[PDB]
Amino acid sequence: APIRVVSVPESDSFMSSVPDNSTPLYPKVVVPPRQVPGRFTNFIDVAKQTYSFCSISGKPYFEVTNTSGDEPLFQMDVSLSAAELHGTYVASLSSFFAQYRGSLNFNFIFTGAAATKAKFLVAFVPPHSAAPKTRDEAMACIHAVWDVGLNSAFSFNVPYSSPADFMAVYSAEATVVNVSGWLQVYALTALTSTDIAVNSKGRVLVAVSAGPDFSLRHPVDLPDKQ
Amino acid sequence: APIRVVSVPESDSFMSSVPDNSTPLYPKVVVPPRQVPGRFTNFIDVAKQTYSFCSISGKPYFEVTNTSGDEPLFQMDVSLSAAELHGTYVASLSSFFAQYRGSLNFNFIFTGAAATKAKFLVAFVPPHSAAPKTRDEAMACIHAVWDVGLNSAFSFNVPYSSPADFMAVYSAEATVVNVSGWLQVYALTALTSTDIAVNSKGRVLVAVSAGPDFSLRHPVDLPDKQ
Amino acid sequence: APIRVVSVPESDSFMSSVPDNSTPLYPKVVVPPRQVPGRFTNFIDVAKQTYSFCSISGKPYFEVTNTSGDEPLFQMDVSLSAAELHGTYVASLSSFFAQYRGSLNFNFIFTGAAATKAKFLVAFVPPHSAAPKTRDEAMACIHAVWDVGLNSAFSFNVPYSSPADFMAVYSAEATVVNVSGWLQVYALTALTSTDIAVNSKGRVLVAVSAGPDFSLRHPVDLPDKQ
C-alpha cells in the first residue's frame, strides 16, 4: 500500500533557482487586462533598438579644431566597463550578467556650425601593440573615413573577433578574453569655418547602439560597489 | 508545485521481506553465460525425483529372520521429525518451513542372498489406538503384502488423510495435526535360505521418495539446535 | 488527498553512484559547438588502435648478438602489472579497473644496421612449469620464428586461454587467475653483420597493442601508491 521513497541527502534545503514554483495559498484570483503600450519581454531587445551616449571626459562628445591632425581624437579599450562605455544603457545592462558576444555600433553626430566641415577618420585597433598614437600608425588597421557636410552624422561597426565564443562583461587585468582592443577616431583633416572667429570648434556625439549579433548570457549578482 | 505526501507512522523502519529491492549502486555489469547442467528452480522438485535412506536403528534397513512372525518389523510415527524420517532429504528440507501436505512413498530394496526368499507385509495405521503390535491386529488396516523372489524391491504409498489442509513439518505433543499415524512392516512369512547356515538374515532398504501430491508451504527461521 | 509514503531505512544517505542526477539550479544554458577532431567515447578504443613500448631493463628493446643461441632473450609473466607491461598505455589504463579478458599483441621492430640479419624465435609458455630456460625446452610450446631481412618488424598474438571468463588487472601471489603465463623470445640464430667490427649489436622494439578481443570491466578506486 504505502509507496517507498528515499530522500536525497540534500533534501530539506533551500535552492534559490528551483525550476518549479511553490504552494498556491490564494487561488482563482482573476486579474484585470492591461492596455499599456511600449512593453517588453527581452532586455537585449531594448538596447539593440536604442543608443546611449558614451561619456567622453564627462560629456558625450569630442571636439574638432583646425589645429589637430596627428593626435588621436577618441580612444578606449573595447570592454564593457571601459570608461566611455560606462554610462551607456548597453553597458549598464550588462552588469546583471557575466558574458557578451557582440560587435557594437557607434554613431557620430557632428554638431558644429552649419558653415563648418570637418572631414575625419575612425579606426579599430585589435589587441597587440600598445595603442598606436598617430593615424599614420593607425590607418594601417581597419578604419573608416568620413566627411561631414551633407551627411549630418555617421555609423561605425566595431566587430567581434576573438578565439573565445563569449567574453567578459567585466574588465580586469590584461587577459586574452577581457580586452577586444581599442576604438579610435582621428583628425584626417583639421576642422574649417566661415571664420575661425565665429566658429572655433565643432563637436560630435558618440552614441552606442548594441550590435546586431550581440547578446548577454549568464545572470550574476552584483559584487560590491567600487 | 511541490507534491503533498504523508509518511505512515511505520516509515523509517527496516522490513526483512519488502516486496521490492534497493538502490542500484553499480550498473551495466553484463554477466557471463553458464553451461552447467543439473540446475534447479524448485526444491520440492529434487526431493520428488529422489529418495533418501530412512535411518532405522542407526542403519538404513531392517532384518528378516526365519524366527519372526508376529512381532512388528518397522514402525514410526508418520510426522516429518519422527526418528526414521530424520536423516532423509525430504525431511531435512522441510525444516526451512512449517507445513507439508503430501502422501509419501517408500521403497523396500531387499538385499538378502540370491537364494533367499522372504515374502512379507506392510501396513499404515491411521491415528487412534496405541500402536497395534501383531499383524493379526494390523492387517485389519490398510496393508500390502509382498514376495521377494524375482521382484528385487517394492513400493508403498503412505497417503494423506486428515481434516486439515496442511500439517506440521515439526512434531510436538500429540495433536490432531502433528501425527498422521504409523508406518509398519511385518513378517507375513519368516525368511528362508539354501541353508540356515550360509544365509542367516536378509535385509531390506527403506528409501523415502517424496509423494506425488506433497508440498511444503511457509518458510520459517531455524529455532535452536536440539 | 495527501499521498501515503514510507521512507526506506537507508533514506537520507549519500550514494556515490546513484543512477540519476541532482536538482538543476541553473537552466537554459545553451552551449557553443566544438570543432576539435580526435575525439573519443571509449577508452578501450584508444589502446586497441595504439601500441606502447614495453620497458625492458629501462629501455623499450632487447639486443641480438652473434654470441647468443640458447639463452632466453625476453621473458615476463603475462599479467597486467608484470614489469615490462608496466609503462604501457594498455597496462596503465587498466588500473582504473579490476578485470581484463583479452589476448594481446606485440610487434618486434628490429632496428639493426641495414647490413644486419638476425633470423629468431618467439614463444608463449602457458602457466605450469617454472620458466623454460632454453628454446630446446620452449620450442615444444607455442612459438613463432621470424627472419629480419626484408620484413622490417614482426607481430605475435599472445592469446587468452584460461578457465575464468575475466582475469586480474592486478598481479598478486601465484593464483590460477593472476598469471596467464610468460612471453618469451629467443635467438634461433645468433645475429650477423657486414663486419663484426661496424655492427656489434642489433636491437628490437617490443610494442604492445591491445588485442582484438580484449576489454576491461569494473572500475575501482586507486589503492595506495606502491
Binding site: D20, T23, P27, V30 | P2, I3 | P27
Partner: peptide, 21 residues
C-alpha cells in the same frame, strides 16, 4: 520562465497563478 519540472501543474493554473481576460 524558470519552472521546467513536470510537477508544476500539480495545482492547476487558477490556484497556481492569476488569469488576465
Amino acid at each position: 520562465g524558470n519552472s521546467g519540472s513536470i510537477v508544476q501543474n500539480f495545482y492547476m493554473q487558477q490556484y497556481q497563478n492569476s488569469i488576465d481576460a
